[PDB]
Design a binder for this molecule. Structure first.
Ligand code: S13
Ligand code: S13
Lengths: 808, 808
């Protein structure tokens, strides 16, 4: 517990001070005594005590940026999936052992206190979590970086499983308050909606608007032991200052802008409220940017002092908004303003799936943001003039590249707007960034090849190793010291220990400890028992057809059927865990969750199977749960159809935490296998080239059904009601999709998947060799530190040099 | 400034500690430095520093009540008009001089900082402010007392005057946070709405309800230098824990219950939302009461340990709610439960005006609170059985006394419910309590004479003398010491100084200082100039026909016309100030405000008048403004039609602060004149007997018009458009009401009022004799301390003995 050296020192005066301040907060802040005080009160007492340690560095860091005047990095995102903050703050400030000792002396278990904290679940999954890892890495790399987003009152819904179905409940994360944020009502700014354009004497003027106020809440973002504390600023919607009762109640309408995170992360829903959220962040943020620029030492120097990073197209309105401010308010000529805008803005693309692309109807933009639509049209005209000059007579190219899409509903393609208005465009993994240049944005790449870049995603080894897996962090540090924590490529040193008996022992010991603890978690919180002597086979990620939880389902049923066919034949015991939230309006994803639980209903109660195979659906998968289950995982399921997962980041988390990966050559899986050597990955299935070949001739699921007896059995089980005896036709939609409308070719990878899984089991039967392959994975996970990713953004896009230098 | 002894000591270590903690809060709490810190930041730094001094006493006081186990007093009100808290806290903790010195040493003006604080304007006027004074007095008298109400997100609207008209804006009092309250989300309770009654095995059961959560916020209530800190608990509406987006947005509906204070304090608006607010407070509060009772040592002892005071009929649902809990949940027999309920509950009545009485349609109660309606009917049946037994054959009495009113819309008379369910019923001034027994509740008085009491209202001499008028507080203390501050009857000692040259000098000096300061306030905040050498003639109170701002208007115009008729004739210069908010839906009150400003538009710009007469409308009259204008007042206008103002409390504030009173024999005016001697009051107009005689024969305004040339002139000025030349018919509604539909007989008191005002001017011409009469008023204001009022409630209704004893 305290023996772990990576968790810092418990200095005698530090422990004494922490105890004093803990008690001070319990009294003055919480207004409690030890008589009535609950564990929650004790959590808050510790939270306030720890938060106090950020203040000096937070003030000094921001003062330092004012004095040193570096280029400022503005990271705009509609999602920040931050998780809990208590442990992270302690780790980054080297206070973990000290607080652990302080709380122990007060008769309290700090780990019990940590479990009281709610996730800041202000994101859906990978994209939101990437933003969070990026904030962490930017602070650790000493960048003058500012995360900007919306302070949703309700984050991603809490998932309940009831009767085997997902139920959504409001994530009331602010119920007991947020001790980490600092409300800044004094820095509230006006955001304008609707209205009309007057073109007059000085030029265009946006008038008759409805105002929604944006109140900032600032949250400290500590770097790893470098005394740097950056800021995440999240905007909250407030009704403007100036019958009666109804008028006061109607203030809720404006304030609804920041009420709730949209949970659909796979399908573009052209909801006006989402458009308002996006403009809300953009308008308020850019006001801050402009104000700060003016208070630093004429807009020629703007791109030298400002970088705006667009996390997907969600904040794409930053482009016309910056143009609007520069042209209409600052009175710059269009050409100069555009030069400035392009040099300021860069765009990160996160998916190739067409249904996810933001394409706003022009009528909606005209009504809500009339001036922005005007500006977008002018941008388009000038951009297409450039295309026409570069490719004279290529009319189809003009049509393909246009920001305006011409159908029954005329729309603005926000990706096209982003490319046009950005000096850099990046994908999030090598395979993804390459397909961007090759197909998706081929025309844009040909126009401006220098624009297109790759920035392979990463994860922070603070949250995703030191916090969640201190036991693994410790055994690593015992061999190679602590430098790896902010220099993850040093993990390659561990390759020298592939034959080290002590290290093999310790890697395996740590995994088993994590497995026991997670088993203890499921027993404590859900009264669910799992076999500790089973392979922990884990697929955790949002529920999507492309991620192919359905393929996992087919395999699980295969394992079940094989046991039933040959009950005497030994098989490696497995606990198959699948978790993740479905978008509320995504019927198939909700059916998939029900299928997982239904498979469990049969498998988990078959006396012939017993503890040889168990299938569990992990309820309410979220950042805090990922921190628990990933360190306990033996097998990481990364089984998206080749070409569909832009990068993935869960994959990296598993690799860092001592799990072996079964996966397709998709997203960052490709680079993970390259880093480790393919011999150390369970790679299976179609490559992108194979998927394309199938698309060329037409995907016929019937062929696979007709040729694979074991698949046929499963589909007939699903259709006949074997997994839903009380409602035989329950899974008809799943069967129909698989047989006739499967965009993701589940059947096409079935045989290779099952055979690959056989090899997983074969290796697990050899504990020594399993662990040696694990060492080969952990040792080569260094590339997937978000420090590496951010250093690349800094040097290749932002034009700033990262620094691990400690502030005084 | 600091020289004022009543403001305490500036101890060297105390000043040092305050400065240290001020700086500590600026750093750790506000996350600011002296470079970016605003006056608002400095206010908050001081607020947190001062608030820290309450914590120990707050915890110890509540612990003391647990140990000593006294009878608990629960004061239920839909209104708490608290005002600002910073100065009050400092005064009650003897920290004012210390903080003044501390802030001075830091280079800050504490008075400038105090002006930053928003009023907690969670009330309309007198009733809400009475609750606030009561909380203060109960703490000062060492009572285990608990104020319970609703934490409105928006209090009484901020009043803007635009084009001479009232405009309403949301009172966003929580914009920058409330440093005084402590959120207690852990003690959140469920409140139930709608649903239906099941009568089953154990009995009745309220089922299928919609739940709204009640989250308590606790605010410290410091007693005057007795180390007692009581609690005001205000409930905030929260949506219960368990398409999707719309469902999250719809949480606003439940949360609207605590959104805004209903601003109509003169007309019963049977709004369902108001009914929900009333039940919301009642249900949550009574849950607290029951829980606390059970955690103290079977319901026979309930009335020995619990008193519930109903501030008017607004929390009247406490009666059927307590019955519901006792019968349905605690399983007591009806008779015993009723015995307990009556002994627990007492009712304070605040008006005789019929349109203000709460009479809820039975259909509305059946839908929202079906079980309560059932209980009300049973209460009524049993109560009327008692009436029938006491007055056999008196069928009309039964009809008159029934809780059920039988018209086209069947209604429950909430006053009748209160009388039936309470062991004590009190009016708020001797005249008012007497009319209750004589007419309004005559039948109830005859049934149970012992039930009916008087508790003449009062005001706290902390807020209303020591805080708002330290200069007057000081000159008093110089002669008689500081005991009077919590023993106001000691002011009678000042009668010994009616011929004391030094005291006459000082009383007059203090008044002039206050007048200069208020003149400075109007110049600073509104660029409005007032004549400092003029009589400050002030009518501040909510705008109602019964309060007769219109009568004041007639007098002002009379003064103007008299000047114009005889420009060479000296008149005592006057600044006539009228301020107060009109209920948004009260057309006549809004017209009256416009008339006041319109009169000013003419008078204030007539070169013949100049500074001899000025009429100003004081914008946004509220507690903080009352604290400024009342100490500056020379003449207090208390001119309600006899029988219409139940008590008044503004009257008392003026008397305490060195103003002479012009008023009718109405409400507490009668007792104020009795205390001081009528020779020291400007009493005029019809008594209640005269109003009744007019009602008997019929009020004909035409007679007064026909007989009074000067009145005729004014009405013709109003009708012809003299005060609205651009819209001649603007005031037609006012004229029509005065001439034909005046319930309050403005014309009937016109002649006596004008003649009484002549005598006011005559005395003001004699500064010595004015000041001597002032001394006679201040010296006899002691009865009107809310300490006296609360001591009476304690001894005569609650059965507890007050104590000025200091806690350790
Ligand atoms: C509205 C929305 C929300 C989330 C997402 C994504 C895209 C994605 O995960 N969530 O971004 C991650 C970070 O770059 C990638 O690792 C995932 O492959 C990608 O699907 C897209 C669109
Ligand atoms: C809904 C409502 C609100 C306020 C009031 C009152 C009644 C009143 O002022 N406001 O109570 C004061 C305190 O007892 C009295 O001094 C006033 O005379 C009375 O009008 C009645 C009803």
């Amino acid at each position: 517990r305290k023996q772990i050296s990576v968790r810092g020192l418990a200095g005698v005066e530090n422990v004494t001070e922490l105890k004093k301040n803990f008690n001070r907060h319990l009294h003055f802040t919480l207004v409690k005594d030890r008589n009535v005080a609950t564990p929650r009160d004790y959590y808050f007492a510790l939270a306030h005590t720890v938060r106090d340690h950020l203040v000096g560095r937070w003030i000094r860091t921001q003062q330092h940026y004012y004095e040193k005047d570096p280029k400022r990095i503005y990271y705009l995102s509609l999602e920040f999936y931050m998780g809990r903050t208590l442990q992270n703050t302690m780790v980054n400030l080297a206070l973990e052992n000290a607080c652990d000792e302080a709380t122990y002396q007060l008769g309290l278990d700090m780990e019990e206190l940590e479990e009281i904290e709610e996730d800041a679940g202000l994101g859906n999954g990978g994209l939101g979590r990437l933003a969070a890892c990026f904030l962490d890495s930017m602070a650790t790399l000493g960048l003058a970086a500012y995360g900007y987003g919306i302070r949703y009152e309700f984050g991603i819904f809490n998932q309940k499983i009831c009767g085997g179905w997902q139920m959504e409940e409001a994530d009331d994360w602010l119920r007991y308050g947020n001790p980490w944020e600092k409300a800044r009502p004094e820095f509230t700014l006006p955001v304008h909606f609707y209205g009309r354009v007057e073109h007059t004497s000085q030029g265009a003027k946006w008038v008759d608007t409805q105002v929604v106020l944006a109140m900032p809440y600032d949250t400290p973002v500590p770097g790893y032991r470098n005394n740097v504390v950056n800021t995440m600023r999240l905007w909250s919607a407030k009704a403007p200052n100036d019958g009666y009762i109804q008028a006061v109640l109607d203030r809720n309408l404006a304030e609804n802008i920041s009420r709730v995170l949209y949970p659909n992360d796979n399908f573009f829903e052209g909801k006006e409220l989402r458009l308002k959220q996006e403009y809300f962040v953009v308008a308020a943020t850019l006001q801050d940017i402009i104000r700060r620029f003016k208070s630093s030492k004429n807009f020629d120097a703007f791109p030298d002092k400002v970088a705006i990073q667009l996390n997907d197209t969600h904040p794409s309105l930053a482009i016309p908004e910056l143009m609007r401010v520069l042209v209409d308010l600052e009175r710059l000529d269009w050409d100069k303003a555009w030069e400035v805008t392009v040099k300021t803005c860069a765009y990160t693309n996160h998916t190739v799936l067409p249904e996810a692309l933001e394409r706003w109807p022009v009528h909606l933009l005209e009504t809500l943001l009339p001036r922005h639509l005007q500006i977008i049209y002018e941008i388009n005209q000038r951009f297409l003039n450039r295309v026409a000059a570069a490719f004279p007579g290529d009319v189809d190219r003009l049509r393909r590249m246009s920001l305006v899409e011409e159908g029954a509903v005329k729309r603005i393609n926000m990706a096209h707007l982003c490319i046009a208005g950005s000096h850099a465009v990046n994908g999030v993994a090598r395979i993804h960034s390459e397909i961007l240049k090759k197909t998706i944005f081929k025309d844009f790449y040909e126009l401006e090849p220098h624009k297109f870049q790759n920035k392979t995603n990463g994860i922070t080894p603070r949250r995703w190793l030191v916090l969640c897996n201190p036991g693994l962090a410790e055994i690593i540090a015992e061999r190679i010291g602590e430098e790896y924590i902010s220099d993850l490529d040093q993990l390659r040193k561990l390759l020298s220990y592939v034959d080290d008996e002590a290290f093999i022992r310790d890697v395996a010991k740590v995994k088993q400890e994590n497995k026991l603890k997670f088993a203890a978690y499921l027993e404590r919180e859900y009264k669910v028992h799992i076999n500790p002597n089973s392979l922990f086979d884990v697929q955790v990620k949002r529920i999507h057809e492309y991620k192919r939880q359905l393929l996992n389902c087919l395999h699980v049923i295969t394992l079940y059927n094989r046991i039933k066919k040959e009950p005497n034949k030994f098989v490696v015991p497995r606990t198959v865990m699948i978790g993740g939230k479905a978008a509320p309006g995504y019927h198939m994803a909700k059916m998939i969750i029900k299928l997982i639980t239904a498979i469990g209903d049969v498998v988990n109660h078959d006396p012939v199977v017993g503890d040889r195979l168990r299938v569990i659906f992990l309820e309410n998968y979220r950042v805090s749960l990922a921190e628990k289950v990933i360190p306990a995982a033996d097998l990481s399921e990364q089984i998206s159809t080749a070409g569909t997962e832009a990068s993935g980041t869960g994959n990296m988390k598993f690799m860092l935490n001592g799990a072996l990966t079964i996966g397709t050559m998709d997203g960052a899986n490709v680079e993970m296998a390259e880093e480790a050597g393919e011999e150390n990955f369970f790679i299976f299935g179609m490559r992108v080239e194979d998927v394309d070949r199938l698309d060329q001739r037409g995907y016929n699921a019937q062929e696979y059904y007709d040729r694979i007896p074991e698949l046929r059995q499963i589909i007939e089980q699903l259709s006949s009601g074997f997994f839903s005896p009380k409602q035989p036709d329950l899974f008809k939609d799943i069967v129909n999709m698989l047989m006739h409308h499967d965009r993701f070719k589940v059947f096409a990878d079935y045989e290779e998947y099952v055979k690959c899984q056989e090899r997983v089991s074969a290796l697990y039967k050899n504990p020594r060799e399993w662990t040696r392959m694990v060492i080969r994975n952990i040792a080569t996970s260094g590339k997937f530190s978000s420090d590496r990713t951010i250093a690349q953004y800094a040097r290749e896009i932002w034009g700033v040099e990262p620094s691990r230098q400690r502030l005084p």
